[PDB]
Every structure is written in C-alpha cells, then in structure tokens.
C-alpha cells in the first residue's frame, strides 16, 4: 500500500500512443517519497523486456534473478510517464541501494541536471 | 525543428487516462539536448491552465506576458510523460536562463535526487 521510491510495480501503461508503450508491464517508482504519499499520481520509469542491455547512459540493467520480472531487462530512464496511483496493480520487489544510485545518476543525465 | 531543452511546445497529451491530462495544450521540454536530437521521443513537463499558482516546491510559475500561453500558468513537475516527437504540434517560446534553473531545481525535488 505505501508507494516508495525504487519499488518495482506492475501498472497498466495502456493506452499510450504511439509505439514503445503497451499494456500491463513492470515499472519502477522514481517520484520522491514526500510526493509518493500525498500526490494522487506517481512518476514511473519504464522496464523493457525487449532488447535488454544498457545501450546508453540513460539505461540501467536489472536482472530476473534478484527481481521478480520475467527475463533480464533494462530500466528505460528516457521513457517516463506519470500514472494515477490506481493504475498500479501489484508490487514485485524493490531496488538495492547500489542499483538505485545507478538509476539516480542515469536520471540526471536524461534530464540534463548536471554540469 | 530542433527540439531544445526549455522550449515551450504545444503537443497532444490526449488520450491519457484518467484525470488531470487532456488534449492539445502546452508543455516544456525537459529532456537533455543529446537525447533531444537522436531519440524518437521527448520528455515533457505539463503546463496547467487551472488553479495557477505555485502550490508546492515542484511547481514553477510562468507568465502569459513573456510566454505565448493563454493565461498565467504553472509548470507541473510532478506531472510528466514521454511523447513521441510527432506529437509536438508547434513551438511557442523558450524559458529564460533563470526560469530554467527554477525548473532544474524543482525537478530534482520531485525525483528525490538531492541529499
């Protein structure tokens, strides 16, 4: 019930046009915990089951061993959307402290928050 | 034609369920310029025409004087999505250097990238 940043969920991204996005599939919570409590929506980063390997610095690799997702996947930090909390179906796992820093660094690159 | 970070566009957020999001309305480009060139999609932050005043630190105020939007508005940095570039209709203006830093600071709060 409590939505925390770094948690791996399984929301319904559909219907989102055009390409890339689809139906019920895993995401990761990137919204801060203060907004995670009181906002009616949540910011999620996409988890792709397609060609799964870090292609760019805005990609972070996650494994089907430690995380309940199907096959080896990649966090898409260049593919983001904000969902109303009612779209989250069920939670899977949560990211490690070291894997969350990997997301925190790639997220500042795709948003150009460095320099 | 070149999409730059901080530019104010006018994309078609529809169809995005459930509430809050609607049809053709202004956004601001928050994706970094390296991804702005070669990615098929772009990350945008919502511009709301509703109750327009900074309510939380993830809000940034923008004016209808300097910017071609209708009435005084607010940048919603807690309401984000990634659009395929074909959804951008026409560009309006671009944010000032000082107003972009206001967005850059509020964006790190809603994503919990500080501490």
């Amino acid at each position: 019930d409590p939505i925390r940043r770094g948690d791996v969920y399984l929301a319904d991204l559909s219907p989102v046009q055009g390409s890339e996005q689809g139906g019920v599939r895993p995401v990761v919570i990137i919204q801060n915990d203060t907004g995670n409590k009181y906002s009616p929506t949540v910011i999620v980063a996409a988890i792709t089951g397609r060609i799964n390997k870090a292609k760019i610095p805005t990609h972070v690799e996650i494994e089907k061993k430690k995380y309940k997702l199907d096959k080896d996947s990649v966090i898409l930090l260049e593919q983001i959307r904000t969902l109303d909390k009612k779209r989250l179906k069920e939670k899977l796992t949560y990211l490690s402290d070291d894997k969350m820093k990997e997301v925190d660094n790639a997220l500042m690159i795709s948003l150009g928050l460095n320099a | 034609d070149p999409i730059r970070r901080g530019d104010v566009y006018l994309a078609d957020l529809s169809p995005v369920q459930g509430s809050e999001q609607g049809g053709v309305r202004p956004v601001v480009i928050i994706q970094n310029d390296t991804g702005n060139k070669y990615s098929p999609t772009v990350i945008v932050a919502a511009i709301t025409g509703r109750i327009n005043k900074a309510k939380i630190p993830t809000h940034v105020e923008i004016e209808k004087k300097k910017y071609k939007l209708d009435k005084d508005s607010v940048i919603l940095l807690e309401q984000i999505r990634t659009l395929d570039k074909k959804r951008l209709k026409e560009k309006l203006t671009y944010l000032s250097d000082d107003k972009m830093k206001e967005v850059d600071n509020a964006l790190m709060i809603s994503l919990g990238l500080n501490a």
Partner: nanobody
Amino acid sequence: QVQLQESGGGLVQPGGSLRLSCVVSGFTLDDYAIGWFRQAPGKEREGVSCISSSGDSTNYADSVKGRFTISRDNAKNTVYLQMNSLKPEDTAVYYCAADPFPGVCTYASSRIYEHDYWGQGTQVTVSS
C-alpha cells in the same frame, strides 16, 4: 541480411601501428552505430571505441584515448580503427559490431556499451 567482417590483423612490434577495417553489408551504415571490442584471453571483453549512427560523436576507453582513432566512410560502408602507439597489452581479438538503437554512442562517455550484431573476429598480436 549478412553483416560485418573485419580485416587488417597481424603481428606488430611494441610501439607500432595498424589500421583495422570493418566492411558492412545488409544494412545502411547511417542507421547503425559501429563499435570496436577487443577480448584478450583470460580477460573479459573490453570496449574500445564506437561511432554514432550519424557520425558526429565518438567515444573511446581511457586506456585508448590519444592512441586509437575510429573513422567512418559512409560511401564504402566501411569503418576504420587506426591503432597507434601499440602496446604489447593490446594483443586481443578485435570485433566491429553494429547496433540499431537510437542514440547509441551519442553521449560523451568513457564507457562504450555492448552492441547486438557482431561479426567475425580478427587477430591482433604485438610482441617482439
């Protein structure tokens, strides 16, 4: 269709030079980023350098910058890797690999990410 093939391997003395070529087939060279990956025995595969699908951005590894220079000729569908100041520790099997992902090798990074479509290897040795 068919893909890549590397040529130009051989034996060199320490401090020598060599130019590796990479022929491309079965796709447009302007649609794929091409990278160079070497693999020494007993060691994990190491990325060396990549070219963007457009050609405006080039990245290299720290142990390489100032020595190897990646180049592309779109008219020939041929990618080059000019290897200079060759150390005996550069002995490995070099591969040129293509990847159809948008934005690959565009960011300025010291790490080249693994590609998807590979080619036949080439042997580069360097010792007295």
